Structures are given as structure tokens and as C-alpha cells.
DNA sequence: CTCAAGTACTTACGCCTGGTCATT
RNA sequence: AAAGACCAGGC
């Protein structure tokens, strides 16, 4: 659907958080450029977590509605549970 | 005997906690309910 | 997709060797799967 | 008396010689670890049993419990990637392998 | 032709360890 | 040795 009239929870579900963190960690571990600055962080998982806390993950979540439509939420647009 | 600032903080906490309690879309509720039903059956006696 | 006359077996499928694996007997002999034995019986009676 | 600090234990302990028997069940004969070992001839899946270096079974109840977690790709790994992975070439017109 | 009252299928926890035996 | 059956046993 369009950017207007979006109806889902603005909160990001724990499943979305888990999958986006896993995907971002895999990308980081596969030489993708990091978004947040890293202070001696060699572990991609903590790097992805720090990126999430800074809302800098370059991923948009496509939330499929049961009727076949979908809605695109950037991780920055979604507000972190933690 | 709450104060005004305390009342505002309480309203904020109520809103935040209620929004946290909302079921997350994507949650597998069917399997969760089936397991939450079958688990007590293990501890239930076969005799009446 | 499915016609009535296709439900009468006139051409019998023969599953590949993966479905009915043969077991190497120390390289000297080769035993056969139960499916292979049933296939042998079917081919014998069909030729007869 | 406490073995470490030497202080008297406040409670008085019940001590006496009691007959104890060692059992056949011992950890050295029960511990098992699997990491990409032998596979079954038919299913091309990890073998059965400790002696054959077989893998542990991720039963139906296991996948139901993981579904309750909503752990989709952990389940995919457990049932597709950790166990037998495979690729097939299937036609586009017919849905049958080619 | 068409309704209730007899005859067929189909299934009964989760793994885990091992030892023995007949065919192959 | 292969899968099949049986048996005994642990939680
Ligand atoms: Zn085709």
C-alpha cells in the first residue's frame, strides 16, 4: 500500500527485530559497510545491535497483509521495543 | 494522593506498558495455545 | 490434471535406484531392496 | 565443620554409613556429539545411534515447540540445512523434476 | 427411491542406550 | 557391514 494510510503497529515485533538483526549481522560479517561507528567491535552481532540502537540499519520491512497487500516500514521508522 | 508530575509519569508508564502488552503480529498463536493446553494434561490424573 | 482412464495402471512407473538403493556386499555381491524384488516379480509375471 | 572456612555448620548434619551401589549408567558411555558425520544410505540423513556417530533427532514435538517460538529460519536450518540439503531441477511447464 | 440399522478401515507419547539374530 | 525384527534398559 501507499506510504499514507499505513495500518500496522508502529512498534516493531520481536520477530522482526530478531530477523533484521540476523540479516544485518550476516551482511556485516560478509564485508558490508557498517553504519554506526565501531569501537573495537570484531563481532558482527554486537555491531548489528549497536546499529539497531542507532536506527541506522539500511533495511525496510515489507509487512504482508493477509489480503495480499503489503506495507514497507524502515527500521528507523519502526520504534525499537528496547 | 498522587502529585501532578507523578500522575503524568504514571500515565506515560500505563501507555507504554499497555502498548508493550499488545500481541506481536506474526506470533504463532495456534501452536502456543495447543501446547499451553496439552502441557497441563501431562500433570492431570487419568482417573476421576 | 487427472483423467479417469489414467487411474487404471497400464504403464507402471519404475522408481530410480535412489528410491530402492542397493547395498554393496563387500564388493563381492549386491543385495536388493524389497521394491527391487517386487519389481523383479512384476517383470517376471509380465513377461510370462 | 565447614571444609572451606573451618567454621562449625549451624545445623547438625545427619551422618552415617549407608550402603550405596554404582550403576551401569555412566556418562562416558552416554555422551555423544555430532558434527557432519555419516549419513543414511536411503534418506541421506544423519545416522541413528551413538555407536554409528549418528545425529540427534529433531522430532515433531521439537518443531512444534520451535513454531511456538516463531523461530522460522532456525526451524528451516534444523530441518533442511543442518539435516540433508539438496537441489533438484524441476521444469516450469510441468511441475516435475527434469 | 429412499430412509434407520448392520459391516469394514484406522489409530493409540517423546526420545535415548545397548545386545542378538536370520537374510543378504 | 546394510536394514528388519525382537529383547532388555534410562529419563
Ligand atoms: Zn516439464
CATH number at residue A28: 3.90.940.10
Instruction: Identify the residue among D66, D68, D69, D70 best suited for mutation to test binding to A, counting A beta carbons within 10 A and taking the highest.
Output: D70
Distance CA A9, CA A74 (A): 13
Strand partners, C24: C30
In angstroms, the CA B2 to CA A61 distance is: 42
Chain D residues 34 to 63 whose Cβ lies within 7 Å of strand E are 48-51, 54, 56-57, 59-61
- Using the C1' atom of nucleotide F2, identify the protein residue whose alpha carbon is closest: C23
The DSSP string of A46-63 is HHHHHHHHTT----EEEE
Q: What does the radius of gyration of chain D's CA atoms come to, in whole angstroms? A: 25
The residues, any chain, with a CB within 8 Å of residue B12's CB and separated by 6 or more, are none
Q: From CA D9, how far away is CA D15, in angstroms rounded?
A: 13
Residue nearest to nucleotide E17 (CA to C1'): D30
Tell whether A19 is within 8 A of chain D (Cβ).
yes
- Tell me how far the alpha carbon of residue C7 lies from the centroid of ligand 1, in angstroms: 21
> Across the strands, what pairs with C17?
none
Q: Domain total for chain A?
A: 1
Solved by what technique?
Answer: cryo-EM
Q: Which residues contact C2 (CB under 8 A, 6 or more apart)?
A: none
Phi, psi of A64 (to 5 degrees): -80, 125
Query: Between the CA of residue D68 and those of B21, B29, B41, what are the distances in Å?
Result: 18, 7, 18
Subunit contact A22:D70, Cβ cutoff 8 A: no
Round to whole Å and give the CA distance between A62 and A68.
12
The fourth-level CATH superfamily of domain D39-98 is: RNA polymerase alpha subunit dimerisation domain (3.90.1800.10)
Q: How many CA atoms lie within 13 A of B6 on its CB side?
A: 3
* B27 Cβ contact list (under 8 Å, min separation 6): A13, A15, D70
Angle, nearest 10°, between helix axes D60-69 and B29-43? 120
Sign of CA dihedral D23, D28, D34, D37: negative
Residue A60 domain boundaries: 1-82
Amino acid at each position: 500500500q501507499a506510504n499514507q494510510k499505513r495500518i500496522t503497529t508502529p512498534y516493531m515485533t520481536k520477530y522482526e527485530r530478531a530477523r533484521v538483526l540476523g540479516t544485518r549481522a550476516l551482511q556485516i560479517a560478509m564485508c558490508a559497510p557498517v553504519m554506526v561507528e565501531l569501537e573495537g567491535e570484531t563481532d558482527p552481532l554486537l555491531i548489528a545491535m549497536k546499529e539497531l540502537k542507532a536506527r541506522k540499519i539500511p533495511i525496510i520491512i515489507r509487512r504482508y497483509l493477509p489480503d495480499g497487500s503489503y506495507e514497507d516500514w524502515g527500521v528507523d521508522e519502526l520504534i525499537i521495543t528496547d | 494522593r498522587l502529585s501532578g508530575e507523578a500522575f503524568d509519569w504514571l500515565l506515560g508508564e500505563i501507555e507504554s506498558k499497555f502498548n508493550q502488552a499488545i500481541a506481536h503480529p506474526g506470533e504463532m498463536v495456534g501452536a502456543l495455545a495447543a501446547q499451553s493446553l496439552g502441557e497441563p494434561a501431562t500433570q492431570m490424573t487419568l482417573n476421576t | 490434471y487427472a483423467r479417469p482412464e489414467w487411474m487404471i495402471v497400464t504403464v507402471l512407473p519404475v522408481p530410480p535406484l535412489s528410491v530402492r538403493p542397493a547395498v554393496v556386499m563387500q564388493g563381492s555381491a549386491r543385495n536388493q531392496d524389497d521394491l527391487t524384488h517386487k519389481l523383479a516379480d512384476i517383470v517376471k509375471i509380465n513377461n510370462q | 565443620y565447614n571444609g572451606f572456612t573451618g567454621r562449625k555448620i549451624t545445623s547438625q548434619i545427619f551422618i552415617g554409613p549407608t550402603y550405596y551401589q554404582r550403576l551401569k549408567h555412566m556418562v562416558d558411555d552416554k555422551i555423544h556429539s555430532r558434527a557432519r558425520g555419516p549419513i543414511q544410505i536411503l534418506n541421506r540423513q544423519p545416522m541413528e545411534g551413538r555407536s554409528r556417530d549418528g545425529g540427534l533427532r529433531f522430532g515433531e514435538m521439537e518443531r512444534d515447540c520451535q513454531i511456538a517460538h516463531g523461530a522460522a529460519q532456525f526451524l528451516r536450518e534444523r530441518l533442511f540445512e543442518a539435516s540433508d540439503p539438496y537441489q533438484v531441477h524441476v521444469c516450469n511447464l510441468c511441475g516435475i523434476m527434469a
